[PDB]
């Protein structure tokens with residue numbers, strides 16, 4: 172019975188990794204994730220310059236999940252590139268590097284410089300398509316023209332296989348359009364579904380107040396709130412992008428949640444809110460729990476059930 | 485203390501009502517809602533002709549909420565109009581009629597016929613800006629030009645105060661654009677936020693199957709999953725539409741949940757999943773719970789805290 176995966180020319184002991192932004196901002200974080208039982212790790216989404224991000228409190232968690240408006244705090248590209256180039260031990264597990272430039276030019280400049288490190292060390296790029304574009308316009312992945320622009324430019328400037336982190340969609344027309352745009356780009360080898368469910372609002376009844384400071388309390392939702400949304404998106408893209416991989420992210424607290432992602436079509440499975448709350452010990456528990464479900468059902472490998480969700484009739 | 489209120493030239497004993505589509509399809513259902521302790525009721529969204537809707541199972545509920553792809557099953561406009569004009573007892577509570585024609589023309593045809601009944605009897609219109617998938621086009625409230633068209637045409641055809649049922653948005657630009665569109669129409673006097681969160685996917689781990697039959701298991705989410713989404717939309721529209729009322733819908737199981745909706749800006753508070761699950765007795769509990777929260781805080785009226793959620797600095 173086996174949780175191993177071989178994909179994108181790397182070998183992974185198991186499908187679990189952190190979700191970008193959780194336990195991956197500092198060298199200490201990245202070493203912690205590397206020491207954990209996860210099968211891979213991804214670095215905090217970065218910008219060309221270091222950023223302090225938004226005022227605190229900017230993340231809060233609750234029994235049903237989390238809300239955040241972190242504002243892209245990060246040590247800057249040079250740091251994550253140096254981590255990839257010189258510090259990460261690839262004999263432990265594969266590394267993904269997430270980038271989230273504030274304009275297309277910023278993303279192009281970073282991917283040009285990551286390319287030789289990707290070639291030499293095998294660091295994998297996750298391009299964060301919830302990067303904000305011009306203020307007053309929707310996030311890039313919700314503006315299909317901008318999305319196409321970003322993927323054109325990045326494909327040309329990078330020239331190697333990469334992946335994209337997608338926000339959740341809620342309309343079949345959007346699944347259809349988004350997947351078609353992604354399918355225009357052969358170097359997009361994986362699609363990570365999903366980022367946080369945008370601009371929720373958590374209110375504390377006792378204090379009659381919002382719980383995070385930025386944006387009058389509005390922020391991205393993770394955790395139990397978003398599992399069915401995440402599963403839908405994983406399956407919508409799995410079905411629409413048959414020559415790509417789908418990585419699942421959202422609402423994973425247990426091997427059963429991970430099993431559902433995989434049935435929906437997930438290859439790798441990312442863990443955000445639950446990892447933030449539980450810490451990196453969660454990866455042993457998830458592995459154990461998933462292996463137990465597999466043993467009860469008689470499945471020996473992940474590919475025996477990946478994408479095999481049954482429909483009715 | 486009593487929680488009676490005055491909106492849209494009607495008097496309401498309390499802010500609670502069913503959400504459209506729940507306990508409101510047949511004459512029996514409407515009679516049951518009238519006999520409940522709810523402050524108002526709304527009828528199932530109707531089309532010009534009767535519809536059977538989608539194959540069953542088409543609704544499923546779980547501890548954290550529900551998923552549905554009912555397919556607009558309804559008895560047809562003639563039935564709801566007849567209910568409004570001859571059967572409903574207006575001395576018990578106000579009635580809202582939801583319409584959801586499949587084209588602008590169908591909606592116009594229905595509203596022309598509702599107008600004289602709204603004049604004579606005081607039935608209120610909730611126009612549902614959600615529809616079945618049509619390949620190649622987004623849902624109407626997600627296509628801002630189509631939405632402005634529906635509203636121009638209905639406003640002209642109806643000529644009386646009405647409200648609109650909105651799907652959730654997830655992007656601040658979208659809030660700004662949608663609110664701008666609604667504010668073009670002075671007859672749109674209330675906005676109901678929100679309809680179900682579109683196209684989630686619930687999978688049963690034991691059977692490895694989706695749980696509803698239509699649309700390969702994809703359907704709208706309600707219940708606990710959507711409360712922060714619902715609060716965000718209530719508050720975003722309450723902020724952006726100062727000359728309209730906002731009605732909250734989404735994730736209400738307790739007086740505390742309703743309290744949060746009212747804090748975010750809700751005038752009326754609609755109950756969908758929790759009503760479907762618990763039955764019409766839920767309304768006495770919700771009132772009791774909301775009055776208890778008010779009494780412990782020293783609030784004597786809804787007006788004292790409606791829209792008064794606090795932000796941090």
Ligand SMILES: Cc1cc2nc3c(=O)[nH]c(=O)nc-3n(C[C@H](O)[C@H](O)[C@H](O)COP(=O)(O)O)c2cc1C
Nearest residue numbers: 190191192216365366367393394421422442443444
């Ligand atoms: C504190 C925090 C920071 C995040 N930062 C990033 C980020 O830098 N880049 C990114 O793609 N997603 C980011 N996300 C989104 C997570 O990667 C993830 O998509 C989302 O939380 C959903 O998964 P979950 O339900 O496991 O939390 C962040 C989430 C949290 C809670």
Ligand SMILES: Cc1cc2nc3c(=O)[nH]c(=O)nc-3n(C[C@H](O)[C@H](O)[C@H](O)COP(=O)(O)O)c2cc1C
Nearest residue numbers: 503504505529678679680706707734735755756757
């Ligand atoms: C079984 C079912 C039928 C529904 N039918 C309609 C409808 O006909 N018109 C409509 O505007 N919303 C309809 N909805 C959406 C609800 O009115 C409501 O917006 C949604 O369920 C969110 O509220 P909740 O969290 O209380 O369930 C329906 C929901 C359910 C669960």
Ligand SMILES: CC(C)(C)CCc1c(C(=O)O)[nH]c(=O)[nH]c1=O
Nearest residue numbers: 240241242243301302303367391
């Ligand atoms: C949302 C952005 C600030 C534009 C990018 C980073 C990010 C953050 C964040 O740093 O605020 N939070 C998330 O939930 N998802 C993200 O992708």
Ligand SMILES: CC(C)(C)CCc1c(C(=O)O)[nH]c(=O)[nH]c1=O
Nearest residue numbers: 553554555556614615616680704
């Ligand atoms: C979704 C439609 C079928 C387009 C309209 C009726 C409706 C339904 C429905 O009848 O399936 N379900 C909901 O969650 N919201 C709705 O507004």
